[PDB]
Amino acid sequence: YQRGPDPTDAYLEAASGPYTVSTIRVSSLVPGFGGGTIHYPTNAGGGKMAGIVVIPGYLSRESSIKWWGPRLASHGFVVMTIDTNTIYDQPSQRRDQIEAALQYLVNQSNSSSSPISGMVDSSRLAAVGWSMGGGGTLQLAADGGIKAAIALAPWNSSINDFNRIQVPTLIFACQLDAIAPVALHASPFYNRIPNTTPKAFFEMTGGDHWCANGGNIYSALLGKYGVSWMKLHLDQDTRYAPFLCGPNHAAQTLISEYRGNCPYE
């Protein structure tokens, strides 16, 4: 499943990966979620790719998390950024909508008329979620069915099944978050995940609840670590492991705490 150039730090911190990214609008009338945008690379080599859904949020729309669409897709993934049914939906409703959106992506790849016809490997699916959508992502990770999870400043009930998660999970915490305080959300969620499950915790210095959404002072690190996580766990691409395992991450101004269980085998 490996594709593309041998990575470097500068290549991973740049605003775009090497592939040209096209988009299609998904109507708000689609069943099971609120619509969105499919992002896909046009020149990624002929092989099938993993499929990723990106979900909000805190009382917010697709636009809040859209930055993750091109950032991931330009490195060789089919990535759909979505709206939910309403901005008020709770984390378990968001979980269900991630599953419906992943199935929609599979269905479009299996069609004869979609621009993404043939492109998605339905056995390699993943989710990225902000805030209440991060809680929904962790709930889906606990149930299985995705191969990787990234949570951006997650919010969830302290009553959960996160101690069951077998899915490789990266958590971005926002140091100063007051909506989902790290001490009540991101930190205990990370600590509950089994020590046998590949995981990582990156806390962003000074960040408010929006800090992991990209398009901001943290972009270079969010994109480097997030792309490396998806490459390593969805493509089994060990060339991306040195970006996650080895560096003194907390020596950087923008990282206020790091935790992990490297190496990942």
One Martini backbone bead per residue (centre of mass of N, CA, C, O) as a GRO file, in nm:
protein
  265
    1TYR     BB    1   0.047   0.067   0.000
    2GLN     BB    2   0.279   0.221  -0.096
    3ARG     BB    3   0.350   0.576  -0.169
    4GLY     BB    4   0.577   0.777  -0.286
    5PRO     BB    5   0.784   0.975  -0.142
    6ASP     BB    6   1.034   1.026   0.056
    7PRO     BB    7   1.026   1.156   0.355
    8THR     BB    8   1.031   1.486   0.508
    9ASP     BB    9   0.996   1.748   0.701
   10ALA     BB   10   0.939   1.968   0.486
   11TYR     BB   11   0.730   1.799   0.326
   12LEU     BB   12   0.534   1.766   0.591
   13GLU     BB   13   0.510   2.095   0.653
   14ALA     BB   14   0.377   2.161   0.412
   15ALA     BB   15   0.074   2.274   0.282
   16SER     BB   16   0.149   2.051   0.058
   17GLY     BB   17   0.144   1.790  -0.110
   18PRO     BB   18   0.218   1.639  -0.428
   19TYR     BB   19  -0.083   1.633  -0.497
   20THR     BB   20  -0.356   1.679  -0.686
   21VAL     BB   21  -0.671   1.837  -0.588
   22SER     BB   22  -0.998   1.731  -0.597
   23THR     BB   23  -1.360   1.807  -0.610
   24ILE     BB   24  -1.684   1.720  -0.445
   25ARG     BB   25  -2.013   1.778  -0.400
   26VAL     BB   26  -2.221   1.701  -0.119
   27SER     BB   27  -2.528   1.684  -0.056
   28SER     BB   28  -2.752   1.773   0.208
   29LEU     BB   29  -2.950   1.516   0.098
   30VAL     BB   30  -2.802   1.298   0.214
   31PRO     BB   31  -2.793   1.006   0.367
   32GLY     BB   32  -2.691   1.019   0.728
   33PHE     BB   33  -2.605   1.325   0.661
   34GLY     BB   34  -2.498   1.677   0.563
   35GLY     BB   35  -2.266   1.650   0.382
   36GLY     BB   36  -1.998   1.784   0.150
   37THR     BB   37  -1.643   1.700   0.069
   38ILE     BB   38  -1.458   1.553  -0.185
   39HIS     BB   39  -1.117   1.454  -0.169
   40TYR     BB   40  -0.878   1.404  -0.444
   41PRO     BB   41  -0.633   1.254  -0.616
   42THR     BB   42  -0.509   1.265  -0.964
   43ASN     BB   43  -0.170   1.161  -0.921
   44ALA     BB   44  -0.130   0.860  -0.734
   45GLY     BB   45  -0.087   0.583  -0.959
   46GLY     BB   46  -0.368   0.361  -0.955
   47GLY     BB   47  -0.414   0.296  -0.672
   48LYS     BB   48  -0.567   0.234  -0.402
   49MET     BB   49  -0.735   0.400  -0.123
   50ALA     BB   50  -0.789   0.541   0.155
   51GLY     BB   51  -1.064   0.634   0.370
   52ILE     BB   52  -1.182   0.965   0.493
   53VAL     BB   53  -1.340   1.118   0.774
   54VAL     BB   54  -1.447   1.460   0.855
   55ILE     BB   55  -1.563   1.593   1.180
   56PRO     BB   56  -1.758   1.771   1.361
   57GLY     BB   57  -1.794   1.969   1.673
   58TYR     BB   58  -1.858   2.318   1.779
   59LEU     BB   59  -2.129   2.447   1.664
   60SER     BB   60  -2.048   2.335   1.360
   61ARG     BB   61  -1.920   2.320   1.041
   62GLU     BB   62  -1.734   2.208   0.788
   63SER     BB   63  -1.540   2.460   0.778
   64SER     BB   64  -1.381   2.398   1.052
   65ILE     BB   65  -1.233   2.114   0.901
   66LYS     BB   66  -1.142   2.148   0.593
   67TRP     BB   67  -0.824   2.156   0.595
   68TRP     BB   68  -0.792   1.835   0.607
   69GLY     BB   69  -0.859   1.757   0.319
   70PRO     BB   70  -0.603   1.854   0.150
   71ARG     BB   71  -0.379   1.760   0.340
   72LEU     BB   72  -0.440   1.456   0.302
   73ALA     BB   73  -0.500   1.415  -0.008
   74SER     BB   74  -0.204   1.523  -0.106
   75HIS     BB   75  -0.089   1.220   0.020
   76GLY     BB   76  -0.308   0.972  -0.058
   77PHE     BB   77  -0.635   1.038  -0.012
   78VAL     BB   78  -0.978   0.990   0.059
   79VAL     BB   79  -1.155   1.296   0.158
   80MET     BB   80  -1.436   1.366   0.380
   81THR     BB   81  -1.598   1.655   0.450
   82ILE     BB   82  -1.851   1.730   0.706
   83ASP     BB   83  -2.180   1.737   0.782
   84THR     BB   84  -2.434   1.738   0.993
   85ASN     BB   85  -2.761   1.739   1.058
   86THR     BB   86  -2.673   1.904   1.320
   87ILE     BB   87  -2.504   2.116   1.546
   88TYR     BB   88  -2.638   1.950   1.814
   89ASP     BB   89  -2.518   1.689   1.800
   90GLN     BB   90  -2.418   1.410   1.951
   91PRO     BB   91  -2.166   1.182   1.971
   92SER     BB   92  -2.340   0.927   1.889
   93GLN     BB   93  -2.454   1.055   1.633
   94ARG     BB   94  -2.175   1.104   1.504
   95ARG     BB   95  -2.089   0.815   1.479
   96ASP     BB   96  -2.314   0.729   1.283
   97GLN     BB   97  -2.229   0.940   1.059
   98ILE     BB   98  -1.955   0.828   0.997
   99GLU     BB   99  -2.058   0.553   0.895
  100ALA     BB  100  -2.238   0.667   0.667
  101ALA     BB  101  -2.006   0.821   0.520
  102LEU     BB  102  -1.827   0.575   0.458
  103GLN     BB  103  -2.041   0.428   0.292
  104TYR     BB  104  -2.074   0.643   0.078
  105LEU     BB  105  -1.783   0.626  -0.028
  106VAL     BB  106  -1.799   0.334  -0.116
  107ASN     BB  107  -2.043   0.369  -0.308
  108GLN     BB  108  -1.901   0.569  -0.504
  109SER     BB  109  -1.667   0.380  -0.582
  110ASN     BB  110  -1.885   0.149  -0.686
  111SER     BB  111  -1.950   0.323  -0.904
  112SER     BB  112  -1.966   0.446  -1.255
  113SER     BB  113  -2.007   0.795  -1.214
  114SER     BB  114  -1.798   0.869  -1.024
  115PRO     BB  115  -1.498   1.033  -0.981
  116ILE     BB  116  -1.421   0.782  -0.754
  117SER     BB  117  -1.408   0.544  -0.923
  118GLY     BB  118  -1.215   0.279  -0.766
  119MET     BB  119  -1.038   0.437  -0.521
  120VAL     BB  120  -1.153   0.265  -0.278
  121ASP     BB  121  -1.059   0.089   0.010
  122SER     BB  122  -1.291  -0.071   0.215
  123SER     BB  123  -1.056  -0.189   0.428
  124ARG     BB  124  -0.952   0.141   0.450
  125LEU     BB  125  -1.055   0.321   0.726
  126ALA     BB  126  -1.124   0.663   0.859
  127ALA     BB  127  -1.104   0.912   1.138
  128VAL     BB  128  -1.181   1.269   1.195
  129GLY     BB  129  -1.230   1.467   1.505
  130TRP     BB  130  -1.401   1.741   1.648
  131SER     BB  131  -1.482   1.727   1.956
  132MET     BB  132  -1.774   1.579   1.936
  133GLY     BB  133  -1.645   1.427   1.688
  134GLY     BB  134  -1.419   1.301   1.862
  135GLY     BB  135  -1.605   1.130   2.034
  136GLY     BB  136  -1.728   0.974   1.795
  137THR     BB  137  -1.451   0.854   1.701
  138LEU     BB  138  -1.385   0.697   1.965
  139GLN     BB  139  -1.643   0.524   1.957
  140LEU     BB  140  -1.573   0.386   1.687
  141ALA     BB  141  -1.298   0.271   1.781
  142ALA     BB  142  -1.426   0.086   2.007
  143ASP     BB  143  -1.602  -0.083   1.776
  144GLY     BB  144  -1.480  -0.068   1.519
  145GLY     BB  145  -1.400  -0.034   1.145
  146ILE     BB  146  -1.139   0.119   1.185
  147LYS     BB  147  -0.771   0.183   1.131
  148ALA     BB  148  -0.798   0.497   1.217
  149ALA     BB  149  -0.742   0.778   1.458
  150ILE     BB  150  -0.839   1.128   1.501
  151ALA     BB  151  -0.827   1.371   1.770
  152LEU     BB  152  -0.970   1.700   1.804
  153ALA     BB  153  -1.036   1.816   2.085
  154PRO     BB  154  -1.198   1.624   2.264
  155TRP     BB  155  -1.546   1.541   2.334
  156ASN     BB  156  -1.675   1.359   2.629
  157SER     BB  157  -1.791   1.148   2.816
  158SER     BB  158  -1.672   0.978   3.108
  159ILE     BB  159  -1.864   0.767   2.981
  160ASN     BB  160  -1.686   0.487   2.839
  161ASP     BB  161  -1.503   0.259   2.584
  162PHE     BB  162  -1.183   0.339   2.556
  163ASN     BB  163  -1.058   0.065   2.685
  164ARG     BB  164  -1.105  -0.097   2.390
  165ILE     BB  165  -0.912   0.031   2.201
  166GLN     BB  166  -0.741  -0.093   1.888
  167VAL     BB  167  -0.706   0.172   1.744
  168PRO     BB  168  -0.504   0.387   1.608
  169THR     BB  169  -0.440   0.680   1.825
  170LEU     BB  170  -0.461   1.033   1.782
  171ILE     BB  171  -0.410   1.312   2.015
  172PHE     BB  172  -0.519   1.642   2.016
  173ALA     BB  173  -0.429   1.890   2.240
  174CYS     BB  174  -0.547   2.192   2.410
  175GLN     BB  175  -0.413   2.340   2.661
  176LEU     BB  176  -0.653   2.588   2.709
  177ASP     BB  177  -0.906   2.436   2.712
  178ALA     BB  178  -1.264   2.513   2.806
  179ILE     BB  179  -1.465   2.303   2.669
  180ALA     BB  180  -1.227   2.055   2.671
  181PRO     BB  181  -1.062   1.981   2.912
  182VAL     BB  182  -0.781   1.796   2.932
  183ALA     BB  183  -0.834   1.673   3.228
  184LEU     BB  184  -1.142   1.560   3.119
  185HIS     BB  185  -1.045   1.446   2.825
  186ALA     BB  186  -0.785   1.389   2.649
  187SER     BB  187  -0.617   1.260   2.878
  188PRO     BB  188  -0.804   1.025   2.984
  189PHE     BB  189  -0.849   0.900   2.710
  190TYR     BB  190  -0.557   0.820   2.652
  191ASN     BB  191  -0.507   0.652   2.920
  192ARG     BB  192  -0.736   0.428   2.855
  193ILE     BB  193  -0.586   0.322   2.638
  194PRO     BB  194  -0.427   0.066   2.551
  195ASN     BB  195  -0.083  -0.018   2.563
  196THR     BB  196  -0.112  -0.206   2.290
  197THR     BB  197  -0.203   0.054   2.149
  198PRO     BB  198  -0.140   0.265   1.920
  199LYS     BB  199  -0.018   0.591   2.043
  200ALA     BB  200  -0.091   0.958   2.078
  201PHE     BB  201   0.020   1.278   2.243
  202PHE     BB  202  -0.055   1.624   2.149
  203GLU     BB  203   0.021   1.925   2.300
  204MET     BB  204  -0.078   2.263   2.244
  205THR     BB  205   0.049   2.553   2.295
  206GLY     BB  206  -0.208   2.775   2.395
  207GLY     BB  207  -0.466   2.627   2.315
  208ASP     BB  208  -0.768   2.623   2.194
  209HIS     BB  209  -1.039   2.444   2.080
  210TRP     BB  210  -0.923   2.522   1.765
  211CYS     BB  211  -0.614   2.426   1.733
  212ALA     BB  212  -0.667   2.140   1.549
  213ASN     BB  213  -0.796   2.270   1.262
  214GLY     BB  214  -0.613   2.461   1.136
  215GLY     BB  215  -0.501   2.743   0.979
  216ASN     BB  216  -0.245   2.812   1.173
  217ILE     BB  217   0.023   2.803   1.392
  218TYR     BB  218   0.004   2.457   1.380
  219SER     BB  219   0.009   2.331   1.091
  220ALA     BB  220   0.283   2.185   1.052
  221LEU     BB  221   0.234   1.974   1.284
  222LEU     BB  222  -0.040   1.861   1.223
  223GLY     BB  223   0.036   1.758   0.937
  224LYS     BB  224   0.274   1.579   1.002
  225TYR     BB  225   0.140   1.390   1.216
  226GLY     BB  226  -0.126   1.313   1.062
  227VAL     BB  227  -0.002   1.194   0.805
  228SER     BB  228   0.181   0.987   0.943
  229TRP     BB  229  -0.044   0.823   1.075
  230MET     BB  230  -0.192   0.737   0.812
  231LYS     BB  231   0.047   0.607   0.667
  232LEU     BB  232   0.125   0.396   0.881
  233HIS     BB  233  -0.176   0.263   0.934
  234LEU     BB  234  -0.299   0.247   0.631
  235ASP     BB  235  -0.014   0.178   0.454
  236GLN     BB  236   0.230   0.060   0.616
  237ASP     BB  237   0.441   0.320   0.634
  238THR     BB  238   0.756   0.323   0.779
  239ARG     BB  239   0.872   0.601   0.678
  240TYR     BB  240   0.682   0.761   0.907
  241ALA     BB  241   0.789   0.684   1.193
  242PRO     BB  242   1.028   0.899   1.255
  243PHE     BB  243   0.817   1.141   1.311
  244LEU     BB  244   0.695   0.985   1.583
  245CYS     BB  245   0.979   0.816   1.640
  246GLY     BB  246   1.250   1.002   1.831
  247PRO     BB  247   1.171   1.274   1.878
  248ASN     BB  248   1.175   1.577   2.074
  249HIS     BB  249   0.883   1.713   2.081
  250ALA     BB  250   0.896   1.899   2.356
  251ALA     BB  251   1.121   2.106   2.237
  252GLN     BB  252   0.890   2.253   2.115
  253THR     BB  253   0.709   2.526   2.151
  254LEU     BB  254   0.417   2.389   2.042
  255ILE     BB  255   0.492   2.164   2.266
  256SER     BB  256   0.371   2.082   2.603
  257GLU     BB  257   0.302   1.767   2.535
  258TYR     BB  258   0.411   1.416   2.541
  259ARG     BB  259   0.279   1.090   2.429
  260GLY     BB  260   0.381   0.730   2.411
  261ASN     BB  261   0.428   0.378   2.243
  262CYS     BB  262   0.692   0.343   2.132
  263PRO     BB  263   0.699   0.138   1.901
  264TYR     BB  264   0.536   0.048   1.589
  265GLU     BB  265   0.417  -0.308   1.513
   0.00000   0.00000   0.00000
